[PDB]
Amino acid sequence: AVKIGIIGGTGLDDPEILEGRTEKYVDTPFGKPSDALILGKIKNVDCVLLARHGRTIMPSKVNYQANIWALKEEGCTHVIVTTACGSLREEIQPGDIVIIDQFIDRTTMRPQSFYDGSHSCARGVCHIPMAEPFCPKTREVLIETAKKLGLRCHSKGTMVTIEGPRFSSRAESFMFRTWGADVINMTTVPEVVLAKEAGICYASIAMATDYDCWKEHEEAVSVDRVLKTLKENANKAKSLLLTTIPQIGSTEWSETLHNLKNMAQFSVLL
Template identity: 85%
Template sequence: MAAAAVKIGIIGGTGLDDPDILEGRTEKYVDTPYGKPSDALILGKIKNVDCVLLARHGRHHTVMPSNVNYRANIWALKEENCSHVLVTTACGSLQEEIQPGDLVIIDQFIDRTTKRHCTFYDGQHSSLSGVCHVPMAEPFCTKTREVLIETAKKLGLQCHSKGTMITIEGPRFSSRAESLMFRSWGADVINMTTVPEVILAKEAGMSYASIAMATDYDCWKEHEEAVSVDKVLKTLKGNANKATSILLTAIPQIGSMEWTDTLHTLKTTVQCSVILPKQ
C-alpha cells in the first residue's frame, strides 16, 4: 500500500482564522452538491505541508452557527484531497479547572443542536446512496489528538488533554439553569459548532481534531461575570496566538508521519457503515 499523501484542512473559528499562517496563499471559490462553503478556500503551505484554510463563519463573521454550511465546508476540503481537518473553536468552560485562556483537545461531544444537516447520506444526492450509521464512540482522531497534545506540552501551554464538548444551537448563550444542567451531565466545555462538523468529517473518512480555547465560564459560576461577546473577543484576542503556535508546530510533524493505516481504517469504517438500498 502506497504511503498516504498528507494535506491539512484548517477550519478557523471566531477570531482564529488568520490567513497569514499560510505561505504562498491563493484563493479559490468553489461550489459543492450541498451549496457553497462559508467563504473562499485559501490554499498555501505551512513549512512545505499543503494546507487549505477556511473561515467557518466567513472572513467577516457573517454566518451564524446554525447557518454554517457544514456539509459544504467538509465536502470542499475533501474535494481538495485533504486527509486531515484541524479546527479551532472558542468555547465556554463548564469546569473550574479549565480557566479562560486554557486550551482543550476535546475527545467527546454531546449534541444539543436541532436544526442542522448531520449526514451527507440524506437521500437527496445520488453520488451518496444509502443510509450511513457511522460509529461515533471515538469522534476525534486519536493519533492526531496526540500530536496536538504533545505539541502543546512542548510549547509550555496550559492544555487539557481531553474534554467533552456540548454543542448548543445558539446563537444565544445558555441560561444559568442550562449551564448548570450541562455541568451535571459531565460536559467540560460548551460551543455552537463542533456538531455536525466532527460527524461529517468522520463520514468523509478524514482525520479530525479540534483545538478548543476557553474564553469564559459560561454563566454557571457564582461571583464570576457571565459570558458576553465582549469578554469572548477580548480573551480570544489575547490568546489566539496559542492555537496558531500549535498549528504551526504540529502541522509539519503531521506531514512527516505515516498515516496510511489510520486513513485506511477511517475509510473502511465509513464503507462498513452504509446500508445500501435493496435492488
C-alpha cells in the same frame, strides 16, 4: 500525501506563513462553502484554510455539509479546527487549551449526514460510529506539542454543542455539568460527524474564553468577554497549529486513514 484542512485558522492567511498562496471559490452538491478555500503550503505541508463564518453567519446556518465536502474534494486527509468555548469546570481556565475527545449534541436544526436521500454523490443510509469522534493520533500530537510550548492544556474534554445563537441559561449551564460536559460551544456538531462520514482524520483545538454562567463570584459570558479573551489568547492556538502542522507532515498515516475509510464505507446501507 498529507493535506491539512484548517477551519478557524486564526492568522494563518499571511504571506509570512502561507507560501504559494492561492484562493479558490468552489461549488458542492450541498451548496457553497462559507467562503473561498485558501490554498498553500505552511512549513512545507499542503494546507487548505476555510473561514467558518465567512467575511456574517449564525452557527445554526453554517453550511457544514458544503464545508466538509469541499475539503474532502480538495484532497484533505486531515482537518484541524479551532474553536472558542465556554468552560464548565473550575480547572479549565479562560485561555486554556482543551484537546476535546467527546461531544454531547444539543443542536436541533442541523443536517448531520451527507447521506440524505437527495444526492447521487452520497447514495443510501449512513450510520456512522461515534464512539471515538476525534482522530486519536492528531489529538496526541496536539497534546505533546502543547507541552513542548509550555501551554496550559487539557488532554481530554467533552464539548456540548448548543444550537444558539443565544447563550445558555444558568439552569442549562448547571444541567450540562451534571451530564458530564466540560466545555461548551456552537459549532463542533455536526462538523465532527460529517468529517467522520468523509473518512477524514478530524481534531479540534478548543480555547476557553469564559466560564459560561454557572460560576459564583464570576461575571457571566457576553460577546464582549469572549472577544476580549480571544484577543488576549489567540496567539496560543496559532503557535499550536503552526507547530503541529510539520509533525502531522512527518507522521505515518496509511493504516489510520485506511481504517477511517473502511469504517465510513461499512457504515452505508445501499
